[PDB]
Scaffold this active site. Structure first.
Site, PDB file in Angstrom:
ATOM      1  N   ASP A  61       0.963  -0.941   0.106  1.00 28.19           N
ATOM      2  CA  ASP A  61      -0.075   0.379   0.191  1.00 28.19           C
ATOM      3  C   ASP A  61       1.047   1.161  -0.063  1.00 28.19           C
ATOM      4  O   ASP A  61       1.735   1.627   0.911  1.00 28.19           O
ATOM      5  CB  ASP A  61      -0.603   0.252   0.891  1.00 28.19           C
ATOM      6  CG  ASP A  61      -2.303   1.455   0.575  1.00 28.19           C
ATOM      7  OD1 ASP A  61      -1.546   1.950   0.598  1.00 28.19           O
ATOM      8  OD2 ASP A  61      -3.408   0.432   1.403  1.00 28.19           O
ATOM      9  N   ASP A  66      -3.156   2.470  -5.651  1.00 26.72           N
ATOM     10  CA  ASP A  66      -2.088   2.478  -4.867  1.00 26.72           C
ATOM     11  C   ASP A  66      -1.941   1.114  -3.690  1.00 26.72           C
ATOM     12  O   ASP A  66      -1.592   0.825  -2.723  1.00 26.72           O
ATOM     13  CB  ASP A  66      -2.022   3.470  -4.197  1.00 26.72           C
ATOM     14  CG  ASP A  66      -3.004   3.765  -3.035  1.00 26.72           C
ATOM     15  OD1 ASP A  66      -4.499   2.919  -3.122  1.00 26.72           O
ATOM     16  OD2 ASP A  66      -3.379   4.928  -1.752  1.00 26.72           O
ATOM     17  N   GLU A  67      -2.844  -0.035  -4.488  1.00 29.45           N
ATOM     18  CA  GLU A  67      -2.895  -1.252  -3.512  1.00 29.45           C
ATOM     19  C   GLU A  67      -2.707  -2.325  -4.769  1.00 29.45           C
ATOM     20  O   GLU A  67      -3.307  -2.218  -5.883  1.00 29.45           O
ATOM     21  CB  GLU A  67      -3.911  -1.753  -2.653  1.00 29.45           C
ATOM     22  CG  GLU A  67      -4.682   0.116  -1.949  1.00 29.45           C
ATOM     23  CD  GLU A  67      -5.940  -0.401  -1.050  1.00 29.45           C
ATOM     24  OE1 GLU A  67      -6.320  -1.265  -1.096  1.00 29.45           O
ATOM     25  OE2 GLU A  67      -6.194   0.822  -0.646  1.00 29.45           O
TER      26      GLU A  67
END
Lengths: 335, 337
Positions: free
Chosen positions: B7, B101-102
């Site tokens: 993350d 973003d993951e």
């Protein structure tokens, strides 16, 4: 084998006299517009106004005629209805062009007399429902059925029995053979080939180096009375529809209307048949093709197609990150 | 199975201070405008003054009205995310890009224990730091849910492993509201029935819970409390590569369709990279917007020239067996090596 050939008499000019019935007897010429003559009726074709001559040469020959522009899609719709009425008469049909169709009727009639009477019922049915007259030719293959109609036109019907075939083999000019141009026939005339029998008295390879191999076997096989080309009835292996969306999307509930509309157009565009395979087809934002399908051993009802297409489109969204631009369905494996 | 979750800490805000290093300690927030809109992400320093992500902008203009505000630079954020995801595929063959973003990585076949997973996760943090100047949080556990929980407790710039033994402990001791996928309102419905920990979902009958929390989350929660939640990492791989091109005019002449068909071959083979297909399909969209398709499979590979010659004869077969006019024409390639 018994072939029945249907040819629509001067189709483009005849359709114009149906929609506007005032052009009876008056010469009518349809043209592509400075331009060329598309079709002329019997009234104008009698005076050397053929198809392929420039318009202004035709207005030399007869200035007091009615000249109409090419309304191609008007003529296509009439043709589509007449072809549909011919399909009604026998399953094995080959649509050769907008005004030509070949019907295999070996299983519907036993002789040429019954084929003749069947062609009479076809001419009256076309005249009843579209007010179009046709010429019907009946013989043992596609070529001689076409020759029959060329000799009987317009508004004709002619049978060519097997003994008249052997007479025509020795007597018909090469130029009168369907599928053979006028310059190929002029090349054969200059070398001594005028009649169809004349190809029997020449070696195959020698004639091949003259007019090519396709036409050489075509001519020789007809002269031998061994021309056995079948009726090529086209069958749709798959029936479907792809529809464009207003925006690229990845929301299932926005794509569903477009996907369901494609089902309704496709399910009811093949008369009396049920599919075993459904395929969902997605065109992505970059105009790539992603598709997933399923086969049911039994039929796919229209409702089954609804719930299965959603699961297939769901499977597409899980396995591909791109946005979808067009969405469609494809049905196959009919029973 | 060992899952490794990555993350990016305040990604939009962090990538912006990569491009502008003067924002050291200065509170910065990135906002999406849609009059006005809402705040996309906020950084560490602004996050301590009650300015978080998800709430409007002018709401932030009374709490922190003199901090740096920046518009959405979405294309830069996307390009930075893609390089990082590509760097991650080097470390693992199986990966699932869950969002901007993951990303989840399945590393069961690359490490032997959780200690080696820890060492792999630490070197991933230092490679993302050296090649993009981005700090990330790493979570390692037995499934996606507990790998994310590990990251949510170690963030920001953290790395945490959750043993098989601490999973069972967290089932008994972790608050219900801290479970990913359920919010405050659903967790409150459970707290007033007696359900405060994950283990408490097993200690009362199914269909009462099922008829109050919704059904999908009822089985989700019980799946976790039984520690048999083992949903695999969904790796996306492109089955086929192709392109369909619209023609200016519907036609049936092979010589006129050939240029469009050849254009779709040139684009497909540039998108194949170092891939070689064994199947080729020519796809034709007729005037009534129906799809007609014919394909061929080659035991060896398909050249670019074979594709040129095989697409022509495939289009000939299409034109041979369908009477409708062709509106769009394309190719697709499948069965990769």
């Amino acid at each position: 084998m018994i072939v029945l050939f249907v040819d629509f008499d001067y189709f483009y000019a005849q359709v114009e006299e149906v929609l506007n019935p005032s052009l009876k007897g008056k010469p009518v010429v349809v043209c592509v517009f400075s331009g060329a003559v598309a079709t002329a009726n019997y009234e104008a074709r009698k005076f050397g106004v053929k198809a392929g001559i420039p318009i202004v040469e035709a207005k030399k020959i007869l200035p007091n005629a009615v000249y109409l522009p090419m309304r191609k899609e008007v003529y296509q719709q009439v043709s589509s209805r007449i072809m549909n009425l011919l399909r009604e008469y026998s399953e094995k049909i080959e649509i050769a062009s907008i005004d030509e169709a070949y019907l295999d009727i070996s299983d519907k009639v036993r002789d040429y007399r019954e084929a003749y009477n069947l062609g009479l019922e076809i001419k009256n049915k076309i005249l009843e429902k579209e007010k179009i007259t046709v010429t019907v030719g009946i013989s043992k293959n596609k070529v001689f059925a076409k020759i029959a109609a060329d000799m009987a036109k317009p508004n004709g019907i002619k049978v060519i029995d097997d003994e008249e075939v052997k007479r025509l083999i020795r007597e018909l000019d090469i130029a009168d053979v369907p599928g053979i141009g006028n310059i190929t026939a002029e090349k054969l005339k200059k070398l001594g080939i005028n009649k169809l029998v004349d190809t029997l008295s020449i070696e195959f390879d020698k004639l091949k180096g003259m007019i090519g191999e396709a036409k050489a076997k075509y001519l020789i096989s007809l002269a031998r009375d061994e021309y056995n080309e079948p009726i090529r009835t086209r069958v749709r292996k798959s029936i479907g529809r792809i529809v464009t969306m207003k925006r690229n999307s990845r929301n299932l509930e926005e794509i569903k209307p477009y996907l369901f509309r494609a089902i309704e157009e496709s399910y009811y565009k093949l008369d009396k048949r049920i599919p075993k395979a459904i395929h969902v087809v997605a065109v992505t934002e970059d105009l790539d093709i992603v598709s997933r399908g399923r086969t049911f051993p039994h039929g796919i009802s229209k409702e089954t197609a609804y719930s299965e297409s959603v699961k297939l489109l769901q499977k597409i969204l899980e396995e591909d990150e791109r946005k979808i631009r067009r969405i469609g369905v494809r049905f196959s494996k009919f029973i």
